[PDB]
Design a protein around this ligand. Structure first.
Ligand SMILES: [Ca+2]
Ligand SMILES: [Ca+2]
Ligand SMILES: [Ca+2]
Ligand SMILES: [Ca+2]
Ligand SMILES: [Fe+3]
Ligand SMILES: [Zn+2]
Lengths: 378, 166
């Protein structure tokens, strides 16, 4: 008779209760149907189990999404009823919950204000899943660019690394391409301007946005930078100064914008409010000072990543606009699998410690004669 | 006289003589082997979480102690004259507790457990152990061979950092 087989993997797993990820990557026959349309539930279910996908499928999803996005206006027009969402930041398991609270994309309109990647250790999953939804629901699901959807930031934070480990630098490159394609802004129902960051001193009319050429890495200054980067001032609606814009000391680039700057823009353009994300909120949202003319809050912040960074312990929120009622749905964080900082494996992690400690022991052992012969952290 | 010792090491005669002096000073009961408790009587080893792993590897005949041959051959792994593959194969053996030539999920978990202590929940440790194995396992047996291990950590140059003068 022949040699016995390897023992069952996980025959000796110590914590046997913990779910074990899939060992197989999804293939195109499993993801795409006869017509070349992706099957979301097959994709979602596999990603939730921490499964990966064949590289060709990653590219294909990312490129198809990019092609659709590329065609869209830089300021898209979008009408109620809709669900508007703020930063996601790689928080895939929260994104799942976001959709349970928001409703299925199959019968629910969505607008995302950007910042899908970085910080969370499931950024590529967020991207693949949103891109498939964009592919399935091109006319009811919308994605804007956030300041993290660019080379500078994803190189600096975790996302370029995430791609390198889970997929390939080729996938990271396809993502940079697709990100250059994301619309910069949305006019919602002719009343609301939606952008990730906010205003720019060089932006006075809606046309000033429509004109912009978005197909590039964002500059270190200018209108495009400011849309993705600006914040309201720390004292918005209560400022001592009447300055419209001041340099943004917190971001290190772009500007703060004052309540006067916001009123002027709303008034000149017949908008009711500005809807943006970009800044974490302990409540998942924040409604700023209401303009006198309308009694409606002149600025709204929506933040959709609960318990941001596992530390903030903040609620998340989405904004449901229907029947002329704008209603905030709050939600709490969800469990997610663990990853070592910068996606390193336990060998890469522990090997240097092993080296130190074994060498140290030996060095000590060998110093038992002084020329007579002549604690591990993440 | 006794019979000669056969052995394989990077050391010359003098180096062997020098390690011999250390060996005898360590052998407390002057018995010819080196017990675990003799190793532990060096204070600066009582809080080293890899002491038993190292002894285990040194102890090639599996009898629980370290005789002179195994002591030479063990230290030879750390000679400045040793090669990359040698220092790596040693570190591979820190993980391969049962010595069958594969690191299994459980062994990797246990040996990390020795180093990490309570700096991770067992759940977090299990999850990263799982993922590491999946990423590195190129033949789908659920464990890591020496070739797979090296493919992961060959570029890390830690072999350059495990060296002792004798
Ligand atoms: Ca002894
Ligand atoms: Ca022995
Ligand atoms: Ca083994
Ligand atoms: Ca294997
Ligand atoms: Fe953000
Ligand atoms: Zn942002």
């Amino acid at each position: 008779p022949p040699p016995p087989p390897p023992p069952p993997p996980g025959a000796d797993r110590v914590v046997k209760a913990v779910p074990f990820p899939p060992t197989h990557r999804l293939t195109s026959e499993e993801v795409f149907d006869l017509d070349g349309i992706p099957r979301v539930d097959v994709l979602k279910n596999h990603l939730v189990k921490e499964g990966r996908v064949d590289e060709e499928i990653a590219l294909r999803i990312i490129n198809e999404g990019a092609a659709i996005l590329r065609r869209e206006k830089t300021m898209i027009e979008v009408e109620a009823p809709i669900t508007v969402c703020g930063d996601i930041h790689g928080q895939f398991f929260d994104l799942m919950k976001l959709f349970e609270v928001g409703g299925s994309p199959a019968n629910t309109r969505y607008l995302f204000l950007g910042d899908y990647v970085d910080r969370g250790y499931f950024s590529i999953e967020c991207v693949l899943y949103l891109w498939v939804l964009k592919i399935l629901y091109p006319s009811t699901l919308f994605l804007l660019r956030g300041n993290h959807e660019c080379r500078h930031l994803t190189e600096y934070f975790t996302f370029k690394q995430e791609c390198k480990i889970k997929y390939s630098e080729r996938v990271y490159e396809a993502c940079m391409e697709a990100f250059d394609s994301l619309p910069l802004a949305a006019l919602l129902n002719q009343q609301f301007l939606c952008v990730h960051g906010g205003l720019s001193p060089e932006i006075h009319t809606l046309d000033d946005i429509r004109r912009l050429d978005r197909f590039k890495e964002p500059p270190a200054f200018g209108p495009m930078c400011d849309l993705l980067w600006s914040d309201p001032s720390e004292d918005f609606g209560n400022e001592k100064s009447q300055e419209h814009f001041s340099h943004n000391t917190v971001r290190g680039c772009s500007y703060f914008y004052n309540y006067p700057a916001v009123c002027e823009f709303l008034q000149n353009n017949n908008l009711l409010s500005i809807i943006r994300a970009h800044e974490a909120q302990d409540a998942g949202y924040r409604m700023y000072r209401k303009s006198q003319t309308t009694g409606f809050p002149s600025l709204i912040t929506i933040f959709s990543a609960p318990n941001y960074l596992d530390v903030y312990n903040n609620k998340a929120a989405v904004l449901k606009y229907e029947n002329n009622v704008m209603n905030i749905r709050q939600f709490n964080c969800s469990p997610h699998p663990y990853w070592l900082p910068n996606f390193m494996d336990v060998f890469t992690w522990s090997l240097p410690f092993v080296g130190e400690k074994v060498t140290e022991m030996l060095v000590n052992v060998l110093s038992i004669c002084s020329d007579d012969e002549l604690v591990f952290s993440v | 006289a006794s019979y000669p010792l056969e052995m394989c090491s990077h050391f010359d005669a003098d180096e062997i003589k020098r390690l011999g002096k250390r060996f005898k000073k360590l052998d407390l009961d002057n018995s010819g082997s080196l017990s675990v408790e003799e190793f532990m009587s060096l204070p600066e080893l009582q809080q080293n979480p890899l002491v038993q792993r190292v002894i285990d590897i040194f102890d090639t005949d599996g009898n629980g102690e370290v005789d002179f041959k195994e002591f030479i051959e063990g230290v030879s792994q750390f000679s400045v004259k040793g090669d990359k593959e040698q220092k790596l194969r040693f570190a591979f053996r820190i993980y391969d507790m049962d010595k069958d030539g594969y690191i299994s999920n459980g062994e990797l978990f246990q040996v990390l457990k020795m180093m990490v202590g309570n700096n991770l929940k067992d759940t977090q440790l299990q999850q990263i152990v799982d993922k590491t194995i999946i990423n590195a396992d190129k033949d789908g047996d659920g464990r890591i061979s020496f070739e797979e291990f090296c493919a992961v950590v060959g570029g890390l140059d830690i072999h350059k950092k495990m060296v002792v003068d004798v």
